[PDB]
């Protein structure tokens, strides 16, 4: 039924504007107003505002006001939204929202604002970073009977890296944790093993690093020193 | 206009276990205009509860909402691992919508404290100018734990992130790492890195900590 | 011209083994971004070239 599109991630540089596109699937164009809705990583729900497209009604969160403009486009049925002035704390995923109400609404000619959100779409990461495409430089992290050692996959743009120990043979005590983005706009993150100590002067620990918007395919040898 | 607030930050709950989510209003509102999402770790946010208390559709008999005047509740029965995530309340009236701060709601367990170990720069990292620093907090619960970088006991602010993984299925704890970011120049001047850790597990502040070189 | 081609590397280094990729105008800028990534993860050696499969490599 009623069913919301959402346009692909984008990456735009610190002080300029970011556009995305959200069109509807199913129901009706211009009874239920689109909410827009964007989570900052790590942080709660926001709402950035609210339009019914055509009808003309619409309002903006008093922090995105001056700095938003919401619009539409009849033909393509389609519903866009434009932030300026972008800064490090507009990162995150943004989603398009409205009340599916009477869905295919059948000589209705209304409209309606405020109602809660049961249709989502899937969200677009909005990414704000002066950086290009960068491989990661994997760095060592050297060592109750119990040790840790680790890798720490550092500076590389884009998002997602893959870490696995030993062609993926090591599992167990492994933890990758989430890639933080530092301010320098690249991303940083860390991978570790706990294991027994009585193996660090045994057991070879490496760690495979797999960057593919740089096709990179990497490995460490984690060394005590 | 109207600000919304929730209580607990965190709630920790057994498998047959009923807890209450609370959403507080900054001035008296209408039932009408309250709803609860749920936000899976993984997942668009899903829409639990309109108008106060009216359970949207598909949503089963283990949710149910209440409230009146400026404090409203969510009630959870019978909690299921697809439950355990992040609830937000919203007010949706007037002209501006507003979100509460949320609440996570994560699976009780005894309490661990969690294992420290701080790693000194690597020497290929040296080399390029930058230097890090990492101490690693290892399967504790619960999730709140506090991290100090002290260089020549000089408390850190501003250049220090740290990252949280998600809740373990299997043993239910978390694990935190924290990256401490210097450059050459400025790692070369001190003598002294140490990592304070505080977490309830842990009956007074643990320290790791070494000298550059040995 | 803005055409770009896309050049290898390829690291034998003692403790860090495998490849990556970039795309410059020319094999000059290539190795310059390459060298740059060498010396950030802290490999140092002899560097060849293949200008058939446009691939650099480092070896220590
Ligand atoms: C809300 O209404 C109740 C009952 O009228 C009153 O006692 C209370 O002080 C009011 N609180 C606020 C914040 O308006």
């Known amino acids: 039924q009623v069913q919301l599109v959402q346009s692909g991630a984008e990456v735009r540089k610190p002080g300029s504007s970011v556009t995305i596109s959200c069109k509807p699937v199913?129901?009706?164009?211009?009874?239920?107003?689109i909410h827009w809705v964007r989570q900052a990583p790590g942080q709660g729900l926001e709402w950035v505002g609210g339009?019914?497209?055509?009808?003309?009604?619409?309002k903006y969160g008093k922090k995105f006001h001056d700095r938003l403009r919401l619009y539409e486009d009849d033909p393509m049925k389609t519903v866009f939204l434009e932030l300026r002035s972008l800064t490090s704390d507009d990162t995150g995923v943004y989603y398009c929202?409205?009340?599916?109400?009477?869905?295919?609404?059948?000589?209705?000619?209304?409209?309606?604002?405020?109602?809660?959100?049961?249709?989502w779409g899937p969200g677009t990461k909005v990414i704000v970073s002066a950086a290009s495409t960068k491989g990661p430089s994997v760095f060592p992290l050297a060592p109750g009977g119990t040790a840790a050692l680790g890798c720490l996959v550092k500076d590389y743009f884009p998002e997602p890296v893959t870490v696995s120990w030993n062609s993926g043979a090591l599992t167990s005590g492994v933890h990758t944790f989430p890639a933080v983005l530092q301010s320098s706009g690249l991303y940083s993150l860390s991978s570790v093993v706990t294991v027994p100590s009585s193996s660090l002067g045994t057991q070879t620990y490496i760690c495979n690093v797999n960057h593919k918007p740089s096709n990179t395919k990497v490995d460490k040898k984690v060394e005590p020193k | 206009e109207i600000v919304l607030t929730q209580s607990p930050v965190t709630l920790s709950l057994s498998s047959g276990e009923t807890g209450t989510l609370s959403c507080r209003a900054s001035?008296?509102?209408?039932?009408?205009?309250i709803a609860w999402y749920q936000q899976r770790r993984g997942q668009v946010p899903r829409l639990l509860i309109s108008?106060?208390?009216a359970r949207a559709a598909g949503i089963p008999d283990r949710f149910t909402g209440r409230g009146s005047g400026t404090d409203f509740t969510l009630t959870i029965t019978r909690l299921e691992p697809e439950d355990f995530g992040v609830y937000s309340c919203?007010?949706?009236?007037?002209?501006?919508?507003?979100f509460g701060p949320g609440t996570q709601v994560d699976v009780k367990r005894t309490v661990a404290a969690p294992s420290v170990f701080i790693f000194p720069p690597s020497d290929e990292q040296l080399k390029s100018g930058t230097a890090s620093v990492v101490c690693l907090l290892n399967n504790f619960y619960p999730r709140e734990a506090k991290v100090q970088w002290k260089v020549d006991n000089a408390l850190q602010s501003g250049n220090s992130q740290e990252s949280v993984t998600e809740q373990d299925s299997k043993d239910s704890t978390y694990s935190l790492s924290s990256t401490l970011t210097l450059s050459k120049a400025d790692y070369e001047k001190h003598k002294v890195y140490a990592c304070e850790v505080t977490h309830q597990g842990l009956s007074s502040p643990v320290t790791k900590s070494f000298n550059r070189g040995e | 011209t803005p055409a770009v081609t896309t050049y290898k590397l390829v690291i034998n280094g003692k403790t860090l083994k495998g490849e990556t990729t970039t795309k410059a105008v020319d094999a000059e800028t290539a190795e310059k971004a390459f060298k740059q990534y060498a010396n950030d993860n802290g490999v140092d050696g002899v560097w060849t070239y293949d200008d058939a499969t446009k691939t650099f490599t480092v070896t220590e």
């Open positions: 929202t409205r009340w599916r109400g009477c869905g295919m609404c059948p000589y209705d000619t209304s409209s309606y604002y405020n109602d809660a959100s049961d249709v």
């Open positions: 199913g129901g009706t164009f211009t009874n239920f107003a």
């Open positions: 339009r019914v497209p055509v009808v003309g009604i619409y």
């Open positions: 001035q008296n509102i209408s039932s009408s205009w």
């Open positions: 108008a106060a208390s």
């Open positions: 919203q007010y949706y009236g007037g002209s501006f919508f507003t």
